[PDB]
């Protein structure tokens, strides 16, 4: 349910916030 | 040599979701998505999660290469974030790299994505 893609790898950097 | 990692951590995190616990992991692959933020794929010997990110505070290991693809670290302080879906994001705050990558130089076991 991750993957190497823009929409996970936003999802990610976004819930650092 | 997978008596050197947290057999089962993953799981633990994946499910119990608690944050006392101080696992011992191998980092597999570190990514920068963006000032950059990395993505690391993690494994405690057993399973293998992707949804691991670094803190920017952190982000001194990787540029000096301390933290890097094999070496094996010890998370000292990490947040979990469980998104809406229900996958979780596990926020690395504060870790130790035990064994360089130079040092340990191969995965350690088969690990197999969680779920």
New interface residues.
């Given amino acids: 349910?991750?993957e190497?893609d823009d929409v996970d790898?936003?999802?990610?950097?976004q819930?650092?916030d | 040599m997978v008596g050197q990692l947290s057999e089962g951590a993953i799981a633990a995190i994946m499910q119990k979701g608690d944050t006392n616990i101080k696992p011992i992991l191998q980092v597999i692959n570190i990514?920068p998505?963006?000032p950059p933020?990395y993505?690391l794929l993690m494994s405690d010997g057993l399973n293998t999660?992707?949804?691991f990110?670094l803190?920017?505070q952190l982000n001194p290991l990787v540029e000096e290469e301390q933290l890097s693809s094999n070496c094996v670290c010890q998370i000292h302080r990490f947040i979990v974030?469980t998104?809406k879906d229900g996958?979780r994001?596990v926020?690395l705050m504060e870790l130790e790299v035990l064994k360089s990558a130079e040092a340990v130089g191969v995965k350690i076991g088969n690990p197999v994505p969680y779920?």
Avoid: E, G, K, Q
């Fill in positions: 349910t991750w190497a790898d936003d999802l990610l950097y819930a650092c | 990514r998505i963006t933020r993505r999660l992707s949804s990110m803190a920017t974030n998104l996958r994001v926020i779920n």
